[PDB]
Design a protein around this ligand. Sequence first.
Ligand code: NAG
Ligand code: NA
Lengths: 125, 196
Amino acid sequence: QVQLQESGGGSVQAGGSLRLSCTPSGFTVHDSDMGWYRVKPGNECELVTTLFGDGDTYYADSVKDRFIISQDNAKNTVYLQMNNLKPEDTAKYHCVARGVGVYGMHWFCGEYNFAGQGTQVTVSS
Amino acid sequence: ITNLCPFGEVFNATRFASVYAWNRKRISNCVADYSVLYNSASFSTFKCYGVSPTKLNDLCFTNVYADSFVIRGDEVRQIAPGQTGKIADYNYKLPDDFTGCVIAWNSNNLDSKVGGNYNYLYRLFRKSNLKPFERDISTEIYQAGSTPCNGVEGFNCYFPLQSYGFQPTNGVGYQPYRVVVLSFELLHAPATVCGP
Ligand SMILES: *[C@@H]1O[C@H](CO)[C@@H](O)[C@H](O)[C@H]1NC(C)=O
Ligand code: NA
């Protein structure tokens, strides 16, 4: 069985922070590059971040320096630290294993990616 | 033999195959100017075995095969006789006595994407090594232990393919390289692919 255990979302006021935690079950964060997509109102999918194998990071221009991805291999967990949140950050956030890997050939947001249920984030006025 | 051999469709294809599902094109009934390719400053690898590139224009073969795919830059060394590693072992295997040329060039500008391109795959698990020129496109779950998998990925139950993650700021060893392997076949049968 393969799955992602996701936590840390919910409701927060603008200017606040959240921390998402994502732990694979049946495989590890070492198997593929980990990241997050977010599905904004209107079913608008956007790649938020990815931690590449080489240790480099991608961020969407709109979240750079406010959001930080990190990984703890020993804990088999990847984290998204979300600071200084804004109303336009409201979305369903989806941890992903990018690409094809030991967990199978899956799709998310039109590309190869293994997602799960995700975590709603709602940022109020 | 008046037509020019259709190499452009191979070398200039918009999309390349994943290495596990490497493409093969038969070239026949045509005139090939190998020297023009060889004296192309377009290639960072142009390595021939059992033939001289400076003499290939002199020779006729029965058929030529042009195999193509993408791999990492630090994997191009595996596309040669006598090599080991996940590409030679489980994806694309040359024979010890290969007669042909291995051609490669950096394709970061075409094959990387911002955020990562994961559409190029390689086979990471296999029960045995490929024989020379074998192709395996199967996707059965790899049973790494003594528990059977029942078609479900999980602990010691691996889907056998893996994405490369090509993103533009990868170091050059982790960048995508396009590869063409030319093999030269002489049967006891007429000979249809000549140099000028
Ligand atoms: C591919 O296109 C380039 C660019 O125009 C051309 O110069 C080159 O000869 C082509 N390669 C082959 C194998 O025809
Ligand atoms: Na990883």
